[PDB]
């Protein structure tokens, strides 16, 4: 399936994944094109924060669903 | 100044905490005692799969905004 990852600049990016793909593996996929380590990535859906252990199907994410991304650039 | 962190029990109870990054593991447990009633004597906190030592800090362990800990009780 296909999903969209939205930043804060408005620069929405495309992606391709399976339901069985882990949250950790998704952040790694964004790194390959965006150049930001997974541990600096915060992924959001439906209002929930997503944990690096569940899968896409756990939070029940479908095709063409939007994810929101927050970067850890400043700590605290 | 203040951060928000989550503390997950294994009973499926999640408590939200207000902490400073500069806060110590001891103060965290004391905050857990303050609203939950569980003694610091009998608390054991986990982050990134490691136990957290009393004398150290939240920042020592790279605990960040909206991070999640697990709380395991001892007997």
């Amino acid at each position, epitope marked *: 399936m296909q999903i969209f990852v939205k930043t804060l600049t408005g620069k929405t990016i495309t992606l391709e994944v399976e339901p069985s793909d882990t949250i950790e593996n998704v952040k790694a996929k964004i790194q390959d094109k965006e150049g930001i380590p997974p541990d600096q990535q915060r992924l959001i859906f439906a209002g929930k924060q997503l944990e690096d252990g569940r899968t896409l199907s756990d939070y029940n994410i479908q095709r063409e669903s939007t994810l929101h991304l927050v970067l850890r650039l400043r700590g605290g | 100044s203040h951060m928000q962190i989550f503390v997950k029990t294994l009973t499926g109870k999640t408590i939200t905490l207000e902490v400073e990054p*500069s806060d*110590t593991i001891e103060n965290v447990k004391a905050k857990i005692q303050d609203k939950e009633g569980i003694p610091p004597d009998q608390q054991r906190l986990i982050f990134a799969g490691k136990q957290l030592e009393d004398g150290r800090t939240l920042s020592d362990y790279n605990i960040q905004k909206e991070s999640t800990l697990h709380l395991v009780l001892r007997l």
Partner: antibody
Amino acid sequence: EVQLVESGGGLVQPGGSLRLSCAASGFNVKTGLIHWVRQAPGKGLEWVAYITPYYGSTSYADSVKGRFTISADTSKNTAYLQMNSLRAEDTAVYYCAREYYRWYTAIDYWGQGTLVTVSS
Amino acid sequence: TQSPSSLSASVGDRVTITCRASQSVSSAVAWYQQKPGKAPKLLIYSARSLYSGVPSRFSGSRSGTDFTLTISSLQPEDFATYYCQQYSSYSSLFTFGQGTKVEIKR
């Protein structure tokens, strides 16, 4: 290994302008922020500006705001400090540095600094 | 803007430098050590935690609104200048305090 090498320092008339460069290596600047900080001879540190290269957002000290322009070029991995309306009191060594989320606001790597002197 | 203030101490002394602070400013206070001719080095971050490779004789503490740097027993290489750094979430401005130069008593 992380390195920050600043250049472009030197001599300007009051009123003149100058561009400082800060070339980074051993890490990618878009994974954090880059700061400029200056130190007048025999005096304390003074924060000047910071940029977050990934977004392009900036912040400036009061003593510098209307006349300095911090900026970054990700492809070159370099950060710049464009200094206009320069005045004698701007005389200092200028360091660039970086903050990485893991050190909770603190600046962990600093270059050796370049000398800017403003005088007629 | 100003010259650092001077502290006279002997090898083995306990030194506590304080950094006066505001309610506005965040408790993410950092400390740096700077030697003559060279760039500052990070000692303490987030008020009281040690940067990688900093000796244990360095500690940091929060005295209410104020923040402190302590060196429990002064070694010869500790004689230098120390700066606190503050950060405000409201303005996104950073500020370094005056700077304290510890010199050797004899």
